[PDB]
A paper describes a structure:
Francisella virulence arises from a 33 kilobase (Kb) pathogenicity island (FPI) that is regulated by the macrophage locus protein A (MglA) and the stringent starvation protein A (SspA). Indeed, while most bacterial SspA proteins function as homodimers to activate transcription, F. tularensis SspA forms a heterodimer with the MglA protein, which is unique to F. tularensis. Thus, our structure unveils MglA as a new member of the SspA subclass of GST proteins.
To gain insight into the function of the F. tularensis MglA protein we determined its structure by multiple wavelength anomalous diffraction (MAD). The structure was refined to final Rwork and Rfree values of 17.3% and 22.8%, respectively to 2.95 Å resolution. Specifically, Arg64, Lys87, Arg89, and Arg93 interact with Asp59', Glu70', Asp74' and Glu97', respectively (where ' indicates the other subunit in the dimer). This leads to the creation of a V shaped morphology in the MglA dimer, whereby the tightly interacting regions of the dimer combine to create a compact surface (“compact face”) while the opposite side of the dimer harbors a large and exposed cavity (“open face”). The relatively low resolution of the structure makes the precise docking of the malate molecules into the density ambiguous and isothermal titration calorimetry experiments revealed no binding suggesting that the observed protein-malate interactions likely occur only at the high malate concentrations (2.1 M) used for crystallization.
Residue numbers in the entry:
A (entry chain B): 0 to 143, 152 to 205
B (entry chain A): 0 to 147, 152 to 203
Write the structure that this text describes.
C-alpha cells in the first residue's frame, strides 16, 4: 500500500523506518542504493525534484520533508502517539523537532559527504558537541512506563550517529551516560539499526 | 488573547491573518516593520531565535513555522476545520500544503529579497508560472473528490494568496481557460480575502 524510499546510512531514513516500525504500519521499503531496485530510483526522480531520500509515497502523494513525513504518518497511523496530546507541549515539541533538524540532523548529513573541508567538518562536530547536552536536556524537560516520543526517538538516532562519526559526548554526569546508554538499548531502535536500509 | 507578529507584504502573515479572520479568533496583529511597534520587535527578538515573522504568541507559547502556526491556531480554535477531518484526506492535504510552501510561498519570499539576483528572479518566476495551474487543479481536484462546499480549506485560501501575490509581483497568471479565470476571480473577490487585504 505504502512506499518508503531509503538509503543505507541516512539518519533520516533510519528515523522514518523506526517510526514506521513502532506504528503498526506496513509499508514497502526500498533501498535505492541497491541496483536490484533501480526502477524505483528512476521513479523516485520523477516524483520529487532531486530524487530526495527518504521519500514516503502513498499511492496518492509523495513527501520528503522529515517533519511532514512524520505528520503524514501520524495522521495515517494515530497509535501510538509521537507527539504530546496538549497544545503547549505539542507546539513547543514541533518547534524543538525543527530545531534538532537544523542543528544535528542536517549537519550529520553534511558530515557524511566527502567533499567537505576537514576543518569545516571539525567545526560542525564541535558545534554539535556544544549543543548536544542542552538539547537532550530540553527533550527530557518536555518529557515531563512512559511512551516513546518523536523527540526522544530522534535524539537516540543522534547519539547513535555521534557514535558512528567518532564524536564523543561531552558530559561527566553519570546519570546522563546511563540514560544515553539506556536509549541506545531500545528493541525497535536496534531492530532498525541491524537492517540497514529496510 | 492572541498576538500575531507580522510584517507588511508578507504572504505568510497575510495567510495567517486570514486564518484568524476565518476562525473568528480576535487577535492583536502587530506590524513589526512599523516604527511605532519597535518595542514589540524587541520583544519578538527575545522569544524567538531569529526575529521570526510571522510568529503567533499565546498565553502559553510562541510558534513561528507556518505549518506549526496553523496547527496551534487550530488546537485553540478547531472549528471551522481548515484541513480534512478524516486521516487519509488530511494527510494528503498536509503534503500538498508543504508542496505549495516549497514551490510557491518560499519562492515568493525569495523574490522579495533585497539582494535578489536577476538570473534567479527569472528562474523562480518561470518555475512558479510553469507549475501554478496544475497545482491549482490538484487543489480543486482534492477538494471535490471527497468533499462533498460552503466553507473554505487552507489549500484554497493559500492558493488565493499565491495568485494575489503573482499579481503583486507583476507575474502574469498563465491560463487562457475561461472556467479557471472565472474561478480565480471568484477566489480573489471572496469576502474574507478582501477584508484581509484591504484592512492592513
Amino acid at each position: 500500500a505504502m512506499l518508503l524510499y531509503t538509503k543505507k546510512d541516512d539518519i533520516y531514513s533510519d528515523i522514518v523506518r523506526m517510526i514506521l516500525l513502532i506504528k503498526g504500519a506496513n509499508a514497502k521499503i526500498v533501498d535505492v542504493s541497491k541496483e536490484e531496485n533501480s526502477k524505483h530510483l528512476e521513479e523516485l526522480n520523477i516524483i520529487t525534484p532531486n530524487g530526495n531520500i527518504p521519500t514516503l509515497s502513498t499511492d496518492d502523494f509523495a513527501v520528503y520533508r522529515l517533519s511532514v513525513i512524520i505528520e503524514a504518518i501520524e495522521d495515517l497511523y494515530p497509535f501510538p502517539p509521537m507527539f504530546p496530546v496538549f497544545p503547549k507541549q505539542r507546539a513547543n515539541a514541533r518547534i524543538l523537532l525543527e530545531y534538532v533538524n537544523k542543528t544535528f540532523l542536517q549537519n550529520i548529513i553534511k558530515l557524511q559527504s566527502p567533499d567537505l573541508d576537514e576543518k569545516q567538518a571539525n567545526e560542525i562536530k564541535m558545534l554539535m558537541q556544544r549543543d548536544i547536552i542542552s538539547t537532550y536536556k530540553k527533550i527530557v524537560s518536555e518529557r515531563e512506563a512512559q511512551n516513546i516520543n518523536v523527540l526522544t526517538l530522534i535524539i537516540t538516532f543522534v547519539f547513535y550517529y555521534f557514535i558512528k562519526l567518532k564524536i564523543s559526548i561531552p558530559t561527566k554526569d553519570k546519570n546522563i551516560i546511563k540514560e544515553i546508554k539506556e536509549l541506545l538499548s531500545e528493541p525497535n531502535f536496534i531492530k532498525t539499526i541491524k537492517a540497514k536500509g529496510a
